[PDB]
Amino acid sequence: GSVIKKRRKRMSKKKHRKLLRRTRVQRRKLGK
Amino acid sequence: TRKCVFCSKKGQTIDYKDTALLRTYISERGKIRARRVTGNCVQHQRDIAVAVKNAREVALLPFGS
Amino acid sequence: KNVPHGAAHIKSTFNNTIVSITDPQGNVIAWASSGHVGFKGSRKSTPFAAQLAAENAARKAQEHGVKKVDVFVKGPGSGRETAIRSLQAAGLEVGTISDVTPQPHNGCRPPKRRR
Amino acid sequence: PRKGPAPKRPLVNDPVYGSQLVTQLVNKVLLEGKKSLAERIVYGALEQAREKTGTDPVVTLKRALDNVKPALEVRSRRVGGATYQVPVEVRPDRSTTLALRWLVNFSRQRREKTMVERLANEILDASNGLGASVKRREDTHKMAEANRAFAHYRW
């Protein structure tokens, strides 16, 4: 295939994981 | 290409005690010679390598002089 | 002291060359280094520096009264042959040359490769 | 000279002596483009040698150049930005060429303030072996023999 597709997917996943890390304590507070 | 001297009828058995037959197959540094050089089959080459390692572990051949 | 027959150790790496003359029992009687002869930095990795270091160490060994020397060499050579010839040209007689380089049997971990 | 060696130039036979060494020397000492003056300079030097040694010029110049003819040379070969000095033997032609070039080039340094006696004196000194050309020859052989180690490139 072409690596542009994997590149788009990796960037989206990277941004989501960064967001998850940024809001860990808040999410634990709300979910509990 | 040569032949496996052990696949012949008169091929002697491989023993880890037999220093001369094992030393036939070790180089001047003590390392074991490759299968292409010696010309023996896979099975007998494995037997030779294991016998040489056994002899090394009991101080009959040097650990790579 | 009077030792008429000693041994020579040449360590030749990619950054320096060290020459040591020892007794047959290993006691060091003279040594010279590639940076001991006025070379600093990368300049001390060249064959010329190895030649000068070998000459200097051979001189120092000669004032202690050594005639014949055996050679054990070690490391990734850049100034091996140069050091051998410099030892020969200083009046010492090179008896035997043997390469003793430590070669592991796959233990320990090499440092990560450069890029 | 990239494809192959150019054909060698012919040498015109010397009319007065019959050997081309003298005409080679006068061609080399020639400068500014004048054959007559250089010819007279070399001939004056040769005749001073005649009157000072009492022997035949051809043979004395022959063994003088033979005694100052180099045998080996040192050549540079560069790898990785660092140079190496390799010894290569020399064909006799370039050996004589270099010897005569040394003679002519250094014949402008004798302090007797005239070129013709300069040539006569240096020719006689090289005939006696005390000339500076002998010194350069010995230096070249010292360089060749001392650095005989670095020749594994085989050139």
Added chain:
RNA sequence: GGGAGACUGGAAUUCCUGGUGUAGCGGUGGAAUGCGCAGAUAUCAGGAGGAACACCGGUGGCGAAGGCGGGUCUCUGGGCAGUAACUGACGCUGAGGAGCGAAAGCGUGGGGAGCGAACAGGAUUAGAUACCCUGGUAGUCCACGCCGUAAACGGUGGGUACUAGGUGUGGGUUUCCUUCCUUGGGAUCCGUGCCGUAGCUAACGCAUUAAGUACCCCGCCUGGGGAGUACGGCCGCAAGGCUAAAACUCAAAGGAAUUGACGGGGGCCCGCACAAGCGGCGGAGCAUGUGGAUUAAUUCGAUGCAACGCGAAGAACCUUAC
């Protein structure tokens, strides 16, 4: 070298103790942090400890995959061939389910040589939270449990039958020459590579180890983003994993191959390109052109090679445009 347990061998790195020994060692494109002169590096002798197993060793073997090689012993799983005595269709697939599952990560207790996220300096640089250098904690290791993901790839689910061949290689049975050894030749079963027809494909390519010709069963797909995200639920100590949308937005996103162009990608061949030699420039003075500052302008163009004794082959007025 399929798996589990126990014991055990040598090389090498580091550290410690002790001789000799002196001023350096280390590192790099070059260095500098750094280690030494309070005795480093180097060279010998003794000792401690941990991890990985040179040579054999490769597109070679084994395993359902993940994966598996120092030696020995004990326990143990699968495959192949020959005979065909035995049971007599007992077979195939398999929604959900269960088990196994690299590395990183988590819990408890050990261990810790080397390597090395994070973290410190040094260097480069306009800046370098990097590449390079010197140190260095978690981890890598062991025991018992968690998580359940990878470009977990042949980007190719499993079972079965048929469709030209040539040539390497691993394991096993047999016939004819038999020198009776040798890949002696043939026949046949099971794996593993290369090349090649017919056939198939958009093309690349596959091609008896099919992506050909056919039958059975399962999983999955329906334009690109939003998004493998939110909401709800299940699992986990945690990290997170699994199931899985909608609003809105675009008129395309893609696959293979062709021709140019480009590369801080290669290989050959040329040129005073290098080498070989001669004579110079760079040092002195003078003559022009130019960059720089001035006043009234110091007229304008020309700017690496490919601008600079060039436009301008002739500035007291004219030429001159100041």
